[PDB]
């Protein structure tokens, strides 16, 4: 006649994430961090070169979320009038995805901080040495040139970031990103969709 | 000196889903299932009426995935030249989300079948009694008129569906849906993005 107390619903079905006020975070400056490639031409030339040497490029990026007045905002790094990027970068050959993201996160925003990364939110592939990227591997494409993996990085209640001088740390509300590929690209603009399944607790 | 065998990585970090060939599925016909609303006007009129009586409309939809030549395809129901929908519908007041989806799935595609639903893939809200929907609750909107929740429904190796005569069961490849809101709407067209985090095993 005994009955078992039910277990918390699977995290795959209901995933709760705690968000904190924008005012809980601050930043201090650090020396500028220049882009590895000076132009679009140099960018794809380096991609072609490395592809022959080490294979497909493996990129990882973190999505840090905060809120203001119960509205989720994604932290972005502004490098130009219309150039925004997520914190992250290229993994080294054989390097573990999550450990690599933690290394890259510390390099870009690190003050000792221990990043919490327990959720994969998406994947994007670049089939050719061209700008187009897709959220799936195109048919008949057995050698994508780049694979980008996005992770949700949970922030602590309060945090201090160290931002390179040439970057501006901004908090972008979802309504600013949604259907705004012209302003943020295909990856950042679809973050609202990718974050919709999360049950955010607005602290 | 003992060492603990490591546990399988969290399902939040790496979620594996088994897919099966398109040829593993078949369908048989059943009596036609007419739409509850005959026009756009009647649709929003009914939404307004029910909103005053029972509150926000709660819709649930299932995303069934199969594959052909290692390419994910989403099952859709075609009702018109350019009208496609996901299987699902409106939940009854107080009804549990997953149990409701299972009921709706059986009503629309049911042959005894036991649907496996362990993953939420997204949420969409309709702020007003108008067509626009968003993957987040707009700022200053405390009473959305409709809340649509999408779930990933895992199929068995083989299955037989019973499809209403006025519907055509189709398998849409991701490349057909991606960035094709004109052809499928904002929800179905962003399924490629929403499914990118899954590690599909192509059986």
mmCIF file of C-alpha atoms in Angstrom:
data_model
loop_
_atom_site.group_PDB
_atom_site.id
_atom_site.type_symbol
_atom_site.label_atom_id
_atom_site.label_comp_id
_atom_site.label_asym_id
_atom_site.label_seq_id
_atom_site.Cartn_x
_atom_site.Cartn_y
_atom_site.Cartn_z
ATOM 1 C CA UNK A 1 0.000 0.000 0.000
ATOM 2 C CA UNK A 2 3.058 2.227 0.222
ATOM 3 C CA UNK A 3 3.381 4.950 -2.389
ATOM 4 C CA UNK A 4 6.590 6.462 -3.693
ATOM 5 C CA UNK A 5 7.132 10.199 -3.507
ATOM 6 C CA UNK A 6 7.470 11.356 -7.109
ATOM 7 C CA UNK A 7 10.843 12.507 -8.411
ATOM 8 C CA UNK A 8 11.385 16.056 -9.703
ATOM 9 C CA UNK A 9 10.392 16.163 -13.388
ATOM 10 C CA UNK A 10 13.289 15.393 -15.795
ATOM 11 C CA UNK A 11 15.481 18.406 -16.593
ATOM 12 C CA UNK A 12 14.873 17.611 -20.278
ATOM 13 C CA UNK A 13 11.187 18.343 -19.751
ATOM 14 C CA UNK A 14 11.390 21.290 -17.342
ATOM 15 C CA UNK A 15 14.656 23.211 -17.053
ATOM 16 C CA UNK A 16 14.717 26.035 -14.494
ATOM 17 C CA UNK A 17 17.402 28.743 -14.651
ATOM 18 C CA UNK A 18 17.936 31.511 -12.093
ATOM 19 C CA UNK A 19 18.435 35.021 -13.492
ATOM 20 C CA UNK A 20 19.621 38.094 -11.588
ATOM 21 C CA UNK A 21 19.191 41.878 -12.017
ATOM 22 C CA UNK A 22 21.431 43.770 -14.419
ATOM 23 C CA UNK A 23 22.508 45.946 -11.475
ATOM 24 C CA UNK A 24 24.109 42.897 -9.815
ATOM 25 C CA UNK A 25 26.900 42.943 -12.387
ATOM 26 C CA UNK A 26 29.760 45.333 -12.993
ATOM 27 C CA UNK A 27 32.933 45.471 -15.054
ATOM 28 C CA UNK A 28 36.477 46.781 -14.888
ATOM 29 C CA UNK A 29 38.740 47.339 -17.888
ATOM 30 C CA UNK A 30 41.715 45.303 -19.114
ATOM 31 C CA UNK A 31 44.106 45.557 -22.066
ATOM 32 C CA UNK A 32 42.448 45.441 -25.513
ATOM 33 C CA UNK A 33 41.996 42.095 -27.251
ATOM 34 C CA UNK A 34 42.478 42.384 -31.006
ATOM 35 C CA UNK A 35 40.741 40.101 -33.509
ATOM 36 C CA UNK A 36 42.937 37.315 -34.868
ATOM 37 C CA UNK A 37 41.984 38.269 -38.428
ATOM 38 C CA UNK A 38 42.209 41.854 -39.708
ATOM 39 C CA UNK A 39 39.833 41.390 -42.657
ATOM 40 C CA UNK A 40 37.255 39.046 -44.151
ATOM 41 C CA UNK A 41 39.843 37.876 -46.668
ATOM 42 C CA UNK A 42 42.383 37.055 -43.960
ATOM 43 C CA UNK A 43 39.647 35.328 -41.971
ATOM 44 C CA UNK A 44 38.784 32.791 -44.640
ATOM 45 C CA UNK A 45 42.400 32.422 -45.706
ATOM 46 C CA UNK A 46 43.329 31.385 -42.161
ATOM 47 C CA UNK A 47 40.300 29.087 -42.020
ATOM 48 C CA UNK A 48 41.409 27.368 -45.240
ATOM 49 C CA UNK A 49 44.976 26.958 -43.996
ATOM 50 C CA UNK A 50 44.034 25.506 -40.624
ATOM 51 C CA UNK A 51 41.435 23.221 -42.193
ATOM 52 C CA UNK A 52 44.169 21.440 -44.150
ATOM 53 C CA UNK A 53 46.318 21.139 -41.029
ATOM 54 C CA UNK A 54 43.968 20.406 -38.128
ATOM 55 C CA UNK A 55 40.589 19.893 -39.787
ATOM 56 C CA UNK A 56 37.174 21.372 -39.021
ATOM 57 C CA UNK A 57 37.240 24.463 -36.822
ATOM 58 C CA UNK A 58 35.548 23.919 -33.469
ATOM 59 C CA UNK A 59 34.089 27.071 -31.944
ATOM 60 C CA UNK A 60 32.255 27.352 -28.616
ATOM 61 C CA UNK A 61 30.297 30.303 -27.303
ATOM 62 C CA UNK A 62 28.629 31.083 -24.029
ATOM 63 C CA UNK A 63 25.247 32.658 -23.541
ATOM 64 C CA UNK A 64 25.136 34.579 -20.252
ATOM 65 C CA UNK A 65 21.689 35.745 -19.202
ATOM 66 C CA UNK A 66 20.588 38.456 -16.781
ATOM 67 C CA UNK A 67 17.343 40.392 -16.510
ATOM 68 C CA UNK A 68 15.895 43.818 -15.887
ATOM 69 C CA UNK A 69 12.258 44.143 -14.867
ATOM 70 C CA UNK A 70 11.632 40.431 -15.487
ATOM 71 C CA UNK A 71 12.933 40.508 -19.079
ATOM 72 C CA UNK A 72 15.832 38.226 -20.126
ATOM 73 C CA UNK A 73 18.890 39.978 -21.600
ATOM 74 C CA UNK A 74 21.848 38.261 -23.239
ATOM 75 C CA UNK A 75 25.325 39.637 -22.559
ATOM 76 C CA UNK A 76 27.142 40.585 -25.757
ATOM 77 C CA UNK A 77 30.490 42.142 -26.577
ATOM 78 C CA UNK A 78 30.251 45.145 -28.890
ATOM 79 C CA UNK A 79 33.320 45.707 -31.063
ATOM 80 C CA UNK A 80 31.860 48.048 -33.650
ATOM 81 C CA UNK A 81 28.865 50.165 -34.567
ATOM 82 C CA UNK A 82 27.075 47.043 -35.813
ATOM 83 C CA UNK A 83 29.456 44.309 -34.676
ATOM 84 C CA UNK A 84 28.434 42.204 -31.672
ATOM 85 C CA UNK A 85 29.677 38.803 -30.598
ATOM 86 C CA UNK A 86 29.118 36.269 -27.840
ATOM 87 C CA UNK A 87 32.000 35.495 -25.505
ATOM 88 C CA UNK A 88 33.858 32.409 -26.684
ATOM 89 C CA UNK A 89 36.207 31.318 -29.418
ATOM 90 C CA UNK A 90 38.192 28.517 -31.024
ATOM 91 C CA UNK A 91 38.965 25.302 -29.149
ATOM 92 C CA UNK A 92 42.421 23.750 -29.400
ATOM 93 C CA UNK A 93 42.720 20.328 -31.071
ATOM 94 C CA UNK A 94 41.588 17.532 -28.766
ATOM 95 C CA UNK A 95 40.352 20.009 -26.159
ATOM 96 C CA UNK A 96 37.110 19.219 -24.310
ATOM 97 C CA UNK A 97 34.207 21.502 -25.345
ATOM 98 C CA UNK A 98 33.110 22.698 -21.905
ATOM 99 C CA UNK A 99 36.611 23.020 -20.486
ATOM 100 C CA UNK A 100 37.567 24.971 -23.590
ATOM 101 C CA UNK A 101 34.624 27.340 -23.200
ATOM 102 C CA UNK A 102 35.571 27.909 -19.556
ATOM 103 C CA UNK A 103 39.133 28.739 -20.644
ATOM 104 C CA UNK A 104 37.871 31.140 -23.317
ATOM 105 C CA UNK A 105 35.366 32.735 -20.930
ATOM 106 C CA UNK A 106 38.091 33.444 -18.369
ATOM 107 C CA UNK A 107 40.369 34.821 -21.086
ATOM 108 C CA UNK A 108 37.704 37.281 -22.219
ATOM 109 C CA UNK A 109 35.681 38.149 -19.105
ATOM 110 C CA UNK A 110 37.625 36.658 -16.199
ATOM 111 C CA UNK A 111 38.318 38.873 -13.179
ATOM 112 C CA UNK A 112 39.100 33.153 -9.507
ATOM 113 C CA UNK A 113 35.774 32.397 -11.194
ATOM 114 C CA UNK A 114 34.164 28.992 -11.707
ATOM 115 C CA UNK A 115 31.789 29.066 -14.675
ATOM 116 C CA UNK A 116 28.743 26.823 -14.470
ATOM 117 C CA UNK A 117 28.063 25.248 -17.865
ATOM 118 C CA UNK A 118 25.489 22.446 -17.826
ATOM 119 C CA UNK A 119 23.339 23.176 -20.914
ATOM 120 C CA UNK A 120 23.900 22.952 -24.664
ATOM 121 C CA UNK A 121 21.468 25.242 -26.445
ATOM 122 C CA UNK A 122 22.390 24.816 -30.101
ATOM 123 C CA UNK A 123 24.755 23.936 -32.941
ATOM 124 C CA UNK A 124 25.623 25.734 -36.192
ATOM 125 C CA UNK A 125 27.734 24.497 -39.113
ATOM 126 C CA UNK A 126 29.567 26.366 -41.862
ATOM 127 C CA UNK A 127 29.591 24.097 -44.957
ATOM 128 C CA UNK A 128 32.071 26.147 -46.997
ATOM 129 C CA UNK A 129 34.737 28.820 -46.598
ATOM 130 C CA UNK A 130 31.958 31.370 -46.955
ATOM 131 C CA UNK A 131 29.804 33.410 -44.531
ATOM 132 C CA UNK A 132 26.643 31.230 -44.609
ATOM 133 C CA UNK A 133 25.978 28.997 -41.571
ATOM 134 C CA UNK A 134 23.131 26.569 -40.861
ATOM 135 C CA UNK A 135 21.585 24.968 -37.745
ATOM 136 C CA UNK A 136 22.021 21.550 -39.360
ATOM 137 C CA UNK A 137 24.566 19.779 -41.544
ATOM 138 C CA UNK A 138 23.482 20.317 -45.176
ATOM 139 C CA UNK A 139 22.693 17.264 -47.276
ATOM 140 C CA UNK A 140 25.745 15.776 -48.980
ATOM 141 C CA UNK A 141 28.113 17.826 -46.804
ATOM 142 C CA UNK A 142 30.470 15.391 -45.090
ATOM 143 C CA UNK A 143 33.207 17.892 -44.237
ATOM 144 C CA UNK A 144 31.833 21.085 -42.659
ATOM 145 C CA UNK A 145 34.544 23.760 -42.360
ATOM 146 C CA UNK A 146 33.347 24.962 -38.953
ATOM 147 C CA UNK A 147 31.166 23.680 -36.124
ATOM 148 C CA UNK A 148 29.925 26.213 -33.589
ATOM 149 C CA UNK A 149 28.414 24.981 -30.319
ATOM 150 C CA UNK A 150 26.422 27.270 -28.008
ATOM 151 C CA UNK A 151 26.154 26.725 -24.251
ATOM 152 C CA UNK A 152 24.093 28.429 -21.570
ATOM 153 C CA UNK A 153 26.417 29.737 -18.848
ATOM 154 C CA UNK A 154 24.675 30.298 -15.518
ATOM 155 C CA UNK A 155 25.810 33.380 -13.634
ATOM 156 C CA UNK A 156 26.099 33.710 -9.860
ATOM 157 C CA UNK A 157 23.926 36.254 -8.012
ATOM 158 C CA UNK A 158 26.636 38.908 -8.360
ATOM 159 C CA UNK A 159 29.733 39.075 -10.544
ATOM 160 C CA UNK A 160 32.580 41.316 -11.644
ATOM 161 C CA UNK A 161 33.862 41.017 -15.210
ATOM 162 C CA UNK A 162 37.129 42.272 -16.696
ATOM 163 C CA UNK A 163 36.447 43.522 -20.233
ATOM 164 C CA UNK A 164 39.127 44.298 -22.856
ATOM 165 C CA UNK A 165 39.228 48.074 -23.446
ATOM 166 C CA UNK A 166 38.244 47.752 -27.107
ATOM 167 C CA UNK A 167 35.049 45.868 -26.153
ATOM 168 C CA UNK A 168 31.844 47.185 -24.613
ATOM 169 C CA UNK A 169 29.871 44.750 -22.419
ATOM 170 C CA UNK A 170 26.187 45.123 -23.239
ATOM 171 C CA UNK A 171 22.973 43.425 -22.120
ATOM 172 C CA UNK A 172 20.604 42.910 -25.049
ATOM 173 C CA UNK A 173 16.905 42.266 -24.357
ATOM 174 C CA UNK A 174 15.287 39.465 -26.343
ATOM 175 C CA UNK A 175 12.954 41.847 -28.174
ATOM 176 C CA UNK A 176 16.043 43.561 -29.595
ATOM 177 C CA UNK A 177 17.450 40.267 -30.963
ATOM 178 C CA UNK A 178 14.330 38.490 -32.238
ATOM 179 C CA UNK A 179 14.008 38.521 -36.049
ATOM 180 C CA UNK A 180 16.873 41.000 -36.221
ATOM 181 C CA UNK A 181 19.427 39.055 -38.264
ATOM 182 C CA UNK A 182 20.368 42.269 -40.076
ATOM 183 C CA UNK A 183 21.526 43.693 -36.780
ATOM 184 C CA UNK A 184 23.006 40.625 -35.078
ATOM 185 C CA UNK A 185 23.491 37.781 -37.540
ATOM 186 C CA UNK A 186 21.638 34.420 -37.766
ATOM 187 C CA UNK A 187 23.022 32.944 -34.553
ATOM 188 C CA UNK A 188 22.477 35.760 -32.053
ATOM 189 C CA UNK A 189 19.079 36.682 -33.554
ATOM 190 C CA UNK A 190 17.718 33.175 -32.962
ATOM 191 C CA UNK A 191 18.731 33.119 -29.296
ATOM 192 C CA UNK A 192 15.246 34.189 -28.232
ATOM 193 C CA UNK A 193 13.877 30.973 -29.828
ATOM 194 C CA UNK A 194 16.681 28.858 -28.329
ATOM 195 C CA UNK A 195 16.019 30.193 -24.836
ATOM 196 C CA UNK A 196 12.219 29.900 -24.943
ATOM 197 C CA UNK A 197 12.148 26.404 -23.424
ATOM 198 C CA UNK A 198 13.819 27.610 -20.224
ATOM 199 C CA UNK A 199 11.745 28.430 -17.155
ATOM 200 C CA UNK A 200 13.479 31.574 -15.915
ATOM 201 C CA UNK A 201 13.226 32.578 -12.268
ATOM 202 C CA UNK A 202 13.508 36.357 -12.060
ATOM 203 C CA UNK A 203 15.399 37.151 -8.868
ATOM 204 C CA UNK B 1 42.801 5.162 -3.802
ATOM 205 C CA UNK B 2 39.506 3.987 -5.259
ATOM 206 C CA UNK B 3 38.125 5.968 -8.176
ATOM 207 C CA UNK B 4 34.486 6.367 -9.117
ATOM 208 C CA UNK B 5 33.316 5.424 -12.585
ATOM 209 C CA UNK B 6 31.994 8.638 -14.119
ATOM 210 C CA UNK B 7 28.266 9.067 -14.674
ATOM 211 C CA UNK B 8 26.809 9.587 -18.163
ATOM 212 C CA UNK B 9 26.940 13.314 -18.982
ATOM 213 C CA UNK B 10 23.782 15.241 -17.934
ATOM 214 C CA UNK B 11 20.951 15.072 -20.479
ATOM 215 C CA UNK B 12 20.879 18.888 -20.342
ATOM 216 C CA UNK B 13 24.391 18.930 -21.780
ATOM 217 C CA UNK B 14 24.175 16.041 -24.257
ATOM 218 C CA UNK B 15 20.752 14.817 -25.365
ATOM 219 C CA UNK B 16 20.728 11.832 -27.734
ATOM 220 C CA UNK B 17 17.619 11.006 -29.789
ATOM 221 C CA UNK B 18 17.151 7.944 -32.002
ATOM 222 C CA UNK B 19 15.720 8.582 -35.475
ATOM 223 C CA UNK B 20 14.428 5.977 -37.929
ATOM 224 C CA UNK B 21 14.047 5.800 -41.738
ATOM 225 C CA UNK B 22 11.027 7.372 -43.406
ATOM 226 C CA UNK B 23 10.233 3.941 -44.876
ATOM 227 C CA UNK B 24 9.623 2.581 -41.355
ATOM 228 C CA UNK B 25 6.381 4.543 -41.142
ATOM 229 C CA UNK B 26 3.066 4.175 -42.913
ATOM 230 C CA UNK B 27 -0.449 5.555 -42.636
ATOM 231 C CA UNK B 28 -4.051 4.507 -43.110
ATOM 232 C CA UNK B 29 -6.975 6.889 -43.564
ATOM 233 C CA UNK B 30 -9.716 7.885 -41.115
ATOM 234 C CA UNK B 31 -12.697 10.250 -41.242
ATOM 235 C CA UNK B 32 -11.836 13.910 -41.958
ATOM 236 C CA UNK B 33 -11.161 16.266 -39.057
ATOM 237 C CA UNK B 34 -12.493 19.755 -39.742
ATOM 238 C CA UNK B 35 -10.951 22.901 -38.252
ATOM 239 C CA UNK B 36 -12.835 24.302 -35.266
ATOM 240 C CA UNK B 37 -12.872 27.751 -36.879
ATOM 241 C CA UNK B 38 -14.029 28.311 -40.469
ATOM 242 C CA UNK B 39 -12.308 31.682 -40.937
ATOM 243 C CA UNK B 40 -9.728 34.019 -39.435
ATOM 244 C CA UNK B 41 -12.539 36.181 -38.083
ATOM 245 C CA UNK B 42 -14.232 33.239 -36.370
ATOM 246 C CA UNK B 43 -10.858 32.129 -35.025
ATOM 247 C CA UNK B 44 -10.142 35.318 -33.122
ATOM 248 C CA UNK B 45 -13.771 35.745 -32.125
ATOM 249 C CA UNK B 46 -13.699 32.331 -30.439
ATOM 250 C CA UNK B 47 -10.340 33.162 -28.858
ATOM 251 C CA UNK B 48 -11.785 36.374 -27.392
ATOM 252 C CA UNK B 49 -14.857 34.585 -26.051
ATOM 253 C CA UNK B 50 -12.953 31.757 -24.395
ATOM 254 C CA UNK B 51 -10.380 34.160 -22.964
ATOM 255 C CA UNK B 52 -13.096 35.861 -20.914
ATOM 256 C CA UNK B 53 -14.421 32.501 -19.732
ATOM 257 C CA UNK B 54 -11.403 30.261 -19.141
ATOM 258 C CA UNK B 55 -8.431 32.581 -19.604
ATOM 259 C CA UNK B 56 -5.264 32.210 -21.673
ATOM 260 C CA UNK B 57 -5.421 29.524 -24.348
ATOM 261 C CA UNK B 58 -2.970 26.693 -23.735
ATOM 262 C CA UNK B 59 -1.824 24.930 -26.892
ATOM 263 C CA UNK B 60 0.606 22.002 -27.111
ATOM 264 C CA UNK B 61 2.221 20.572 -30.211
ATOM 265 C CA UNK B 62 4.387 17.578 -30.883
ATOM 266 C CA UNK B 63 7.443 17.453 -33.074
ATOM 267 C CA UNK B 64 7.909 13.954 -34.509
ATOM 268 C CA UNK B 65 11.225 13.370 -36.243
ATOM 269 C CA UNK B 66 12.306 10.753 -38.773
ATOM 270 C CA UNK B 67 15.116 10.748 -41.314
ATOM 271 C CA UNK B 68 16.005 9.806 -44.855
ATOM 272 C CA UNK B 69 19.652 9.436 -45.822
ATOM 273 C CA UNK B 70 20.805 10.809 -42.454
ATOM 274 C CA UNK B 71 18.762 14.026 -42.733
ATOM 275 C CA UNK B 72 16.179 14.907 -40.040
ATOM 276 C CA UNK B 73 12.604 15.455 -41.268
ATOM 277 C CA UNK B 74 9.730 16.796 -39.188
ATOM 278 C CA UNK B 75 6.290 15.252 -39.669
ATOM 279 C CA UNK B 76 3.679 17.839 -40.625
ATOM 280 C CA UNK B 77 0.003 17.735 -41.513
ATOM 281 C CA UNK B 78 -0.826 19.484 -44.781
ATOM 282 C CA UNK B 79 -4.343 20.916 -44.953
ATOM 283 C CA UNK B 80 -3.940 23.271 -47.884
ATOM 284 C CA UNK B 81 -1.661 24.337 -50.705
ATOM 285 C CA UNK B 82 0.361 26.426 -48.246
ATOM 286 C CA UNK B 83 -1.167 25.371 -44.931
ATOM 287 C CA UNK B 84 0.855 23.030 -42.712
ATOM 288 C CA UNK B 85 0.526 22.364 -39.008
ATOM 289 C CA UNK B 86 2.131 20.252 -36.306
ATOM 290 C CA UNK B 87 0.020 17.599 -34.614
ATOM 291 C CA UNK B 88 -1.447 18.942 -31.388
ATOM 292 C CA UNK B 89 -4.091 21.343 -30.193
ATOM 293 C CA UNK B 90 -5.824 23.025 -27.272
ATOM 294 C CA UNK B 91 -5.562 21.640 -23.743
ATOM 295 C CA UNK B 92 -8.642 21.518 -21.524
ATOM 296 C CA UNK B 93 -8.658 23.685 -18.379
ATOM 297 C CA UNK B 94 -6.554 22.162 -15.610
ATOM 298 C CA UNK B 95 -5.262 19.432 -17.919
ATOM 299 C CA UNK B 96 -1.607 18.385 -17.609
ATOM 300 C CA UNK B 97 0.528 19.517 -20.588
ATOM 301 C CA UNK B 98 2.106 16.183 -21.516
ATOM 302 C CA UNK B 99 -1.000 14.107 -20.873
ATOM 303 C CA UNK B 100 -2.952 16.584 -22.972
ATOM 304 C CA UNK B 101 -0.486 16.332 -25.849
ATOM 305 C CA UNK B 102 -0.706 12.533 -25.699
ATOM 306 C CA UNK B 103 -4.509 12.778 -25.873
ATOM 307 C CA UNK B 104 -4.326 15.170 -28.832
ATOM 308 C CA UNK B 105 -1.701 13.043 -30.594
ATOM 309 C CA UNK B 106 -3.887 9.938 -30.340
ATOM 310 C CA UNK B 107 -6.916 11.898 -31.544
ATOM 311 C CA UNK B 108 -5.063 13.050 -34.654
ATOM 312 C CA UNK B 109 -2.608 10.261 -35.511
ATOM 313 C CA UNK B 110 -3.563 7.357 -33.253
ATOM 314 C CA UNK B 111 -3.981 3.917 -34.833
ATOM 315 C CA UNK B 112 -2.874 1.237 -28.636
ATOM 316 C CA UNK B 113 0.087 3.618 -28.858
ATOM 317 C CA UNK B 114 2.148 5.015 -25.986
ATOM 318 C CA UNK B 115 3.766 8.310 -26.977
ATOM 319 C CA UNK B 116 7.144 9.073 -25.443
ATOM 320 C CA UNK B 117 7.350 12.760 -24.529
ATOM 321 C CA UNK B 118 10.343 13.695 -22.375
ATOM 322 C CA UNK B 119 11.598 16.948 -23.968
ATOM 323 C CA UNK B 120 10.286 20.509 -24.137
ATOM 324 C CA UNK B 121 11.806 22.275 -27.121
ATOM 325 C CA UNK B 122 10.206 25.713 -27.005
ATOM 326 C CA UNK B 123 7.485 28.176 -26.026
ATOM 327 C CA UNK B 124 5.614 30.840 -28.017
ATOM 328 C CA UNK B 125 3.185 33.492 -26.758
ATOM 329 C CA UNK B 126 0.484 35.478 -28.539
ATOM 330 C CA UNK B 127 0.208 38.868 -26.761
ATOM 331 C CA UNK B 128 -2.991 40.017 -28.480
ATOM 332 C CA UNK B 129 -5.955 38.664 -30.430
ATOM 333 C CA UNK B 130 -3.841 39.071 -33.548
ATOM 334 C CA UNK B 131 -1.627 36.765 -35.659
ATOM 335 C CA UNK B 132 1.789 37.812 -34.250
ATOM 336 C CA UNK B 133 3.500 35.395 -31.824
ATOM 337 C CA UNK B 134 6.832 35.665 -29.999
ATOM 338 C CA UNK B 135 9.287 33.224 -28.365
ATOM 339 C CA UNK B 136 9.151 35.310 -25.185
ATOM 340 C CA UNK B 137 6.565 37.264 -23.216
ATOM 341 C CA UNK B 138 6.715 40.881 -24.466
ATOM 342 C CA UNK B 139 7.579 43.597 -21.971
ATOM 343 C CA UNK B 140 4.559 44.944 -20.100
ATOM 344 C CA UNK B 141 2.383 42.039 -21.272
ATOM 345 C CA UNK B 142 0.947 40.378 -18.173
ATOM 346 C CA UNK B 143 -1.953 38.603 -19.880
ATOM 347 C CA UNK B 144 -0.884 36.766 -23.051
ATOM 348 C CA UNK B 145 -3.911 35.501 -25.006
ATOM 349 C CA UNK B 146 -2.247 32.216 -25.966
ATOM 350 C CA UNK B 147 0.697 30.112 -24.817
ATOM 351 C CA UNK B 148 1.968 27.443 -27.191
ATOM 352 C CA UNK B 149 4.355 24.780 -25.885
ATOM 353 C CA UNK B 150 6.343 22.509 -28.217
ATOM 354 C CA UNK B 151 7.518 19.024 -27.239
ATOM 355 C CA UNK B 152 9.761 16.512 -28.970
ATOM 356 C CA UNK B 153 7.883 13.219 -29.359
ATOM 357 C CA UNK B 154 10.172 10.223 -29.828
ATOM 358 C CA UNK B 155 8.924 7.645 -32.305
ATOM 359 C CA UNK B 156 9.407 3.886 -32.049
ATOM 360 C CA UNK B 157 11.420 2.050 -34.729
ATOM 361 C CA UNK B 158 8.256 1.414 -36.753
ATOM 362 C CA UNK B 159 4.782 2.923 -36.538
ATOM 363 C CA UNK B 160 1.400 3.062 -38.234
ATOM 364 C CA UNK B 161 -0.549 6.324 -38.151
ATOM 365 C CA UNK B 162 -4.235 6.933 -38.855
ATOM 366 C CA UNK B 163 -4.582 10.257 -40.691
ATOM 367 C CA UNK B 164 -7.864 12.158 -41.214
ATOM 368 C CA UNK B 165 -8.787 12.041 -44.922
ATOM 369 C CA UNK B 166 -8.581 15.819 -45.321
ATOM 370 C CA UNK B 167 -4.963 15.821 -44.066
ATOM 371 C CA UNK B 168 -1.800 14.693 -45.827
ATOM 372 C CA UNK B 169 1.018 13.368 -43.605
ATOM 373 C CA UNK B 170 4.302 14.777 -44.877
ATOM 374 C CA UNK B 171 7.939 14.591 -43.783
ATOM 375 C CA UNK B 172 9.668 17.952 -44.198
ATOM 376 C CA UNK B 173 13.483 18.082 -44.285
ATOM 377 C CA UNK B 174 15.120 20.797 -42.199
ATOM 378 C CA UNK B 175 16.517 22.577 -45.257
ATOM 379 C CA UNK B 176 12.931 23.075 -46.436
ATOM 380 C CA UNK B 177 11.894 24.720 -43.131
ATOM 381 C CA UNK B 178 14.936 26.846 -42.265
ATOM 382 C CA UNK B 179 14.410 30.583 -42.882
ATOM 383 C CA UNK B 180 11.168 29.780 -44.679
ATOM 384 C CA UNK B 181 8.637 31.627 -42.521
ATOM 385 C CA UNK B 182 6.746 32.634 -45.668
ATOM 386 C CA UNK B 183 6.089 28.981 -46.346
ATOM 387 C CA UNK B 184 5.609 27.607 -42.827
ATOM 388 C CA UNK B 185 5.134 30.400 -40.307
ATOM 389 C CA UNK B 186 7.483 31.559 -37.492
ATOM 390 C CA UNK B 187 7.129 28.458 -35.329
ATOM 391 C CA UNK B 188 7.673 25.643 -37.830
ATOM 392 C CA UNK B 189 10.433 27.559 -39.663
ATOM 393 C CA UNK B 190 12.515 27.861 -36.490
ATOM 394 C CA UNK B 191 12.351 24.140 -35.718
ATOM 395 C CA UNK B 192 15.724 23.567 -37.365
ATOM 396 C CA UNK B 193 17.285 25.933 -34.770
ATOM 397 C CA UNK B 194 15.315 24.340 -31.914
ATOM 398 C CA UNK B 195 16.462 20.850 -32.873
ATOM 399 C CA UNK B 196 20.135 21.708 -33.431
ATOM 400 C CA UNK B 197 21.180 20.873 -29.862
ATOM 401 C CA UNK B 198 20.051 17.257 -30.229
ATOM 402 C CA UNK B 199 22.554 14.529 -31.057
ATOM 403 C CA UNK B 200 20.580 12.452 -33.550
ATOM 404 C CA UNK B 201 21.430 8.796 -34.080
ATOM 405 C CA UNK B 202 20.505 7.872 -37.644
ATOM 406 C CA UNK B 203 19.240 4.296 -37.566
#
